[PDB]
Symmetry: none
Subunit: 30 residues, 5 copies
C-alpha cells in the first residue's frame, strides 16, 4: 500500500544521496 510505496521511494532517494556524497568526497580528494 501507500506506506510501502513511500518507503520504497525513500530507499531510492537515500541510495542516490549516498552516491552523490561519494562523488563529492572523490571530487574534494581530486
Amino acid at each position: 500500500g501507500e506506506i510501502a510505496q513511500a518507503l520504497k521511494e525513500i530507499a531510492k532517494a537515500l541510495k542516490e544521496i549516498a552516491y552523490a556524497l561519494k562523488e563529492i568526497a572523490q571530487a574534494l580528494k581530486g
Copy 2:
C-alpha cells in the same frame, strides 16, 4: 486524513530531492 496528508508531504519532499540530486550530478560533471 492525517496519514494521507503526511504521505502527500513525503511525495512533495521526494520530488524536490530528485530535482536537487540532478543539479548535484550536473555540477559535479562541470
Copy 3:
C-alpha cells in the same frame, strides 16, 4: 495515531534533506 505521527516526522526530515541538498547543489555550482 502513532503511524500518522511517525510519517509527519519523516515528511519533516525529508523537507530538511531537500533543503540541504539544494544548498549542496548551489555550493558545487560555485
Copy 4:
C-alpha cells in the same frame, strides 16, 4: 505496533541525515 516503531526509527535516522547534510552544505558553502 511494529510498523509505527520501524517508522519512528526511520524518522530519527533521516533527521540525523538532514543534520549531516546541512553541515556538508556549510563546509562547501
Copy 5:
C-alpha cells in the same frame, strides 16, 4: 579545513544512510 570537515561528515552520513536502508528493508517485510 573545509575538506577535512566535509569528508568526516560524509563518512558519518553514509553510515546513517546504510542504517536507514536496513530499517526500510525490514519494515517492508512487515
